Design a binder for this molecule. Sequence first.
Ligand SMILES: *C(=N)c1c[nH]c2nc(N)[nH]c(=O)c12
Ligand SMILES: *C(=N)c1c[nH]c2nc(N)[nH]c(=O)c12
Ligand SMILES: *C(=N)c1c[nH]c2nc(N)[nH]c(=O)c12
Ligand SMILES: *C(=N)c1c[nH]c2nc(N)[nH]c(=O)c12
Ligand SMILES: *C(=N)c1c[nH]c2nc(N)[nH]c(=O)c12
Ligand SMILES: *C(=N)c1c[nH]c2nc(N)[nH]c(=O)c12
Ligand SMILES: *C(=N)c1c[nH]c2nc(N)[nH]c(=O)c12
Ligand SMILES: *C(=N)c1c[nH]c2nc(N)[nH]c(=O)c12
Ligand SMILES: [Mg+2]
Ligand SMILES: [Mg+2]
Ligand SMILES: [Mg+2]
Ligand SMILES: [Mg+2]
Ligand SMILES: [Mg+2]
Ligand SMILES: [Mg+2]
Ligand SMILES: [Mg+2]
Ligand SMILES: [Mg+2]
Lengths: 139, 145, 145, 145, 145, 145, 145, 139, 145, 145
Amino acid sequence: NYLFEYAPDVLESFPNKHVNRDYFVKFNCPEFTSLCPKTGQPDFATIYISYIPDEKMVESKSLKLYLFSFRNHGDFHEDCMNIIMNDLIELMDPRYIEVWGKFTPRGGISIDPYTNYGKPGTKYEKMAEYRMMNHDLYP
Amino acid sequence: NYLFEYAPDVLESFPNKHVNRDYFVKFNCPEFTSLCPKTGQPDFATIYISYIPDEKMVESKSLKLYLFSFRNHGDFHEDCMNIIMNDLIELMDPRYIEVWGKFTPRGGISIDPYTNYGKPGTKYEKMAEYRMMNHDLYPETIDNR
Amino acid sequence: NYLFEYAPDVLESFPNKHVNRDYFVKFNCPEFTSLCPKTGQPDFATIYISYIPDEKMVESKSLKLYLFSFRNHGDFHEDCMNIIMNDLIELMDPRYIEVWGKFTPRGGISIDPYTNYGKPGTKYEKMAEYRMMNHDLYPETIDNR
Amino acid sequence: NYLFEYAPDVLESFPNKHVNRDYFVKFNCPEFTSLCPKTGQPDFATIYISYIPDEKMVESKSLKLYLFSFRNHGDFHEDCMNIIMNDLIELMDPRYIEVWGKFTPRGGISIDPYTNYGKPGTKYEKMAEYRMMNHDLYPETIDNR
Amino acid sequence: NYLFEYAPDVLESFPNKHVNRDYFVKFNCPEFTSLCPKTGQPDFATIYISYIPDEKMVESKSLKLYLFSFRNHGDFHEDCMNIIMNDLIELMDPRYIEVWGKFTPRGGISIDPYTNYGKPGTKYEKMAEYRMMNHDLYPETIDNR
Amino acid sequence: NYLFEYAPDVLESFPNKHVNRDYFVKFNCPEFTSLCPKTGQPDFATIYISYIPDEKMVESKSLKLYLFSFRNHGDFHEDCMNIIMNDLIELMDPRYIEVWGKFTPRGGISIDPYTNYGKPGTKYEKMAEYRMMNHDLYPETIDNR
Amino acid sequence: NYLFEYAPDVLESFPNKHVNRDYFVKFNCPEFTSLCPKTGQPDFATIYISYIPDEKMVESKSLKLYLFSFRNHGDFHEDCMNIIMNDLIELMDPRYIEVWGKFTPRGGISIDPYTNYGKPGTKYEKMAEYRMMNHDLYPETIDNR
Amino acid sequence: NYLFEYAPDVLESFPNKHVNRDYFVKFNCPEFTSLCPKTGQPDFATIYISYIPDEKMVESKSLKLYLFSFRNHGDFHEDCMNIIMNDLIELMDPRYIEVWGKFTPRGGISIDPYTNYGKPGTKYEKMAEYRMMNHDLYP
Amino acid sequence: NYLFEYAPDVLESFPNKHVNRDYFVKFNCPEFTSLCPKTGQPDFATIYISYIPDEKMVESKSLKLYLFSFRNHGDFHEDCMNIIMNDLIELMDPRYIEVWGKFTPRGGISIDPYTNYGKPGTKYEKMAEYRMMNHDLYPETIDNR
Amino acid sequence: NYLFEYAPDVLESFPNKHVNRDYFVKFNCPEFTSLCPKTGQPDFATIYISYIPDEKMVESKSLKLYLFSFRNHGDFHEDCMNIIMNDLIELMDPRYIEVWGKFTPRGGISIDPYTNYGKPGTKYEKMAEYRMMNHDLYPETIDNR
Ligand SMILES: *C(=N)c1c[nH]c2nc(N)[nH]c(=O)c12
Ligand SMILES: *C(=N)c1c[nH]c2nc(N)[nH]c(=O)c12
Ligand SMILES: *C(=N)c1c[nH]c2nc(N)[nH]c(=O)c12
Ligand SMILES: *C(=N)c1c[nH]c2nc(N)[nH]c(=O)c12
Ligand SMILES: *C(=N)c1c[nH]c2nc(N)[nH]c(=O)c12
Ligand SMILES: *C(=N)c1c[nH]c2nc(N)[nH]c(=O)c12
Ligand SMILES: *C(=N)c1c[nH]c2nc(N)[nH]c(=O)c12
Ligand SMILES: *C(=N)c1c[nH]c2nc(N)[nH]c(=O)c12
Ligand SMILES: [Mg+2]
Ligand SMILES: [Mg+2]
Ligand SMILES: [Mg+2]
Ligand SMILES: [Mg+2]
Ligand SMILES: [Mg+2]
Ligand SMILES: [Mg+2]
Ligand SMILES: [Mg+2]
Ligand SMILES: [Mg+2]
């Protein structure tokens, strides 16, 4: 009973009851897999998704169906992370978000795509830039 | 007989005998459990609470009884952490507090909410903000085993 | 072009380099996944496969593909570990084989099936029998994280 | 929506498609909790349950509900392990089963009861006596942390 | 209040509801401490106590009270493991019991006494001998850190 | 003989032969134990104490004697880490010092107090604040085993 | 001032208060050091001694002083283990003793001598022989790190 | 200053001062390497050597030069172990000996050659057979 | 046909698949060995090599061979780790590279050299500089076994 | 044949063939032992020594003899770490050095002194202050075993 072709319509949110404070929520996602765009051969990752909400929070079970909808779909690793992040923004429009994918290595290349976004003009935009900068120093 | 419905009133406090300095007290709470509000399904976590006290300290036995009262209480994980923190800010009026909840997976996915608080306009507010900006730069590895 | 419906036909063998000898060959697959028959929801495991060949060895590439062929097959985990063992037995006529499966949890519970075989009448059958009587005397610590 | 008063009847089985082979299945159950009989206070454990089937497997979702069904039932740990074992023997009439429960400490002491059973008059009874007599020759280091 | 000088009387038992089976129960006890009989200097150990009950079980809190009773009691470690064993034999009349204590080092050398018992005349007696013959065949690495 | 009620006087110091440099010395102290002030029930912790000396160092055996002096002394853990810190500040007048205690759990919850200090007015004072601001950013996994 | 030349005379013993049963006492001795007889080069080991006592027990402090006396004493590792055991058989007249020495590598190569002894014509002689026949069936992994 | 072509003459022994008792000595040897006989490509192992002496013991430093003398020599893994064991017998003529080589795996094959020998006719001959039998059950 | 005298010429490169990106590529060599210049005696290590490519990647086969070419080269370990880094830099023009070396002990002491580089002027040079300032803040426990 | 009374003069250096690059070299030294100054009793440690060279490397065989040279010399642990650091600064005049000593426990307490140095007025002095101020933010678990 499961969309395994790409399905952002599945994502869902509930209100944040604590808009006064900045807090962090992290989803750990070790069951992520999707198709590789050229070969067609499955790829696998743990996805770590962290966000500071503004007014809307993503619902867990809807994030899980969302993540499954990748199982039978192909696009690259970097884009894949931007896709996930952008839908999550579209969904929540949060103060801050980051999506870090850790793919099983293939040739010694730990292909570990990292993206983030802070709300434009705000102190989050600078936190993005700062966290991004940090990311490489010890990934 | 224990009360397993939500009970902020249990919480008790005693005077900090060492107000003149900043120190950190941590509680490790591996035995935490509650209900998913939509499902009724139980959910489990380890909660870390750390706080620099001002004039009042939380008494452990009461923190135990307080965390038990979640046992048959539905709420989303993110709310619980915020609610636990608020009851503690209300009881204690701390310089600084953080509550970090690490829940066991559902549907493959586990939720780690982290909230903090510094006393407004003080060096602790800026502290809350530095530890938020910097929270979890190096996320630990999670395989669900 | 990869088959994501169950596909035994993709398994291939080659001549064992030392028939003279008993050596274990070990395969370790951290990315097996299949469907769960009741609900359609995906399942995840690391499969450990060890065997002592007679004349034939499984071509390690083709085993990878074989395992990916489970990605849309729907079966229970116990059954899967037995299908994989059987298919490998049919392909290879091994002296000894075992397949151990470590699933990620569902509902808080994870399921580790372990199945073995040794050639009937041989000391390999004695070996499989002893390994079953002694399997997992000390289960590893599991907290779903 | 869920039963949390003790309910054996929630247990479900399905046929073993591989009756003619001995294999092991393990359930890791890190989310168990019940009440202490005198005090009323919550107990916590990881339960490991490994069993060899004959004709009936226990369905995991149903084992889940069955384990939940202990959240508000009080019993001593030793009892609980034997009750769980007994309701699983009832349900499935298996060749061999073991239940090993590892509880969080109280008063500094933690209690880890281990119970097994092999179908009487068979090699499995001997496996039980063997696994019992060799039980925990090397107990894992415990420091309560 | 809490008796800190030695106290067998505290120990309490309750019937075994499952006498018709053999099962093990273990107590992990990482908080034990006692006195050295010449010097008067405290010593510390983790004690493991595993036993197969017959009709009576030891009540957990009474055990914590019984082990507290060594806090200001002088004895050598070898004697303490035996005394502890004897008081529990006397209270319980168990089918089998063992007491393994791991002490923290002194002058560079730690002492790990291990004593057991089985009901004289029975298969449990032979158990004790087997477990004693085979005790600690692979001793763990200790580096005093 | 050995004083088991609290005793600052025992502490002793000796000159630092290397005052013209900053260096750290740590004491690992896994054998500490004390009383709970309402109940009277013993508690246990590993305490880490690290400090940067100025002119005086703490003499190791005197420290063991000083920590013994809490064995029959009632206090809460938060106060003990501070008292310990104050007696060593008073004895030593160190450039920097911290005392981190990790207690064993009670009713499921362990308390890890962390306090520090640096000479007021100096760069060490800023050290203390930095180490306090950045304390325990990644708290360790505790499961009470 | 301590004596660091070989000194069997230091060893002291006290009565076993529990002669009526067989129990094992283990000493972990991580701090053992001596000299290579040809080189003068110091050599280091961890020694495990385990023994079922008869009427006499070795006193730890004396075992400490005894093992120190190797500090400036040359002998091959295999001899030391045999000599340590003999001094202990001479002092104690035990039912059973084993001494297992694990030395740190020289020239890439480390030497693990293991010796044992059962009281002649008794069930302990047969014990010495069973634990010799079976010694180290599963050697632990050594990489020199 | 080191024989790296095969050199059994290097081995050396000293008397056993305790001929009354059966005891075990084990050498752990993680620095073993030699040449593979066909390809010519280096192979690597930990060698665990255990013996119960009779009257003569092997000297450590001479066992180390002996082991080095393999560095530049080629023969198979199984033979290699029998070679080491046989020289050690020739040297010591012990009550019991076993040589277990654990080579870095190459294709998933843990090529872990195990040989032993008990003194012919004695209770060691049966201990050999028994330990050999044990070896496979959990190697 | 393999060269066992030092042979840089055997290293080969290929086009980086994602120049667009920063990914670490990691090589892990558990079987490096070379000669020690003073004494002629062989030396052993595990070499860890990580780098961020620009346009070129080292062909992993040829790196294996390159490393085997040290088998009769005589040099110190610090020098070796630098020769290997240099040769890799010359071959690949990497953005960032580091080589960490873990030798087996000689005389009781083991030597772990660590060397890095980042393209001069780039943020990679900032990266190498920070990694050197922060390298091995917590050395792993080493007991030569 | 060997010096075991303290002897700085045994230290030897050789030129750095890679002067124009900062790199780290670590010495793991698990075999260290000295005498306690008052008691006369043997002390034991693992010493970690990491340093960045300028023009002179310390030769390891000579560091070996230098460390042996402490076997019969008495000093306190804190002193010994500073003496070792100082004789190594003398010998090599390096960009940066640290000596971290981890000693076996006495009276329950073990002492782990950490000392560093960066060449004064340079970036290395800042690295020392940094590595000092961030020293041991997470102390390793110690249980004395
Ligand atoms: C149940 N506890 C539950 C169900 N869906 C959830 N979504 C989020 N974000 N958090 C929860 O705690 C959820
Ligand atoms: C889904 N795969 C599923 C649902 N219930 C199960 N029960 C058992 N025993 N095994 C499974 O794989 C199950
Ligand atoms: C509470 N669960 C409790 C209290 N006392 C106990 N004693 C034993 N043996 N087992 C328990 O589970 C106990
Ligand atoms: C003190 N507890 C002490 C001192 N010496 C001892 N020797 C032995 N064997 N056992 C002890 O418990 C000892
Ligand atoms: C007993 N030691 C005890 C009981 N309750 C406590 N609460 C706090 N906060 N600290 C303690 O040390 C406590
Ligand atoms: C020095 N301790 C040394 C030198 N050679 C030895 N050979 C053997 N077998 N044992 C030793 O302890 C040796
Ligand atoms: C032999 N390789 C050797 C001998 N002495 C050494 N000293 C140092 N520092 N490094 C080495 O590789 C050495
Ligand atoms: C013995 N080595 C000893 C005795 N007391 C000591 N105190 C300190 N601080 N350091 C030591 O190394 C000590
Ligand atoms: Mg995990
Ligand atoms: Mg885990
Ligand atoms: Mg623990
Ligand atoms: Mg240890
Ligand atoms: Mg733990
Ligand atoms: Mg090791
Ligand atoms: Mg080691
Ligand atoms: Mg330890």
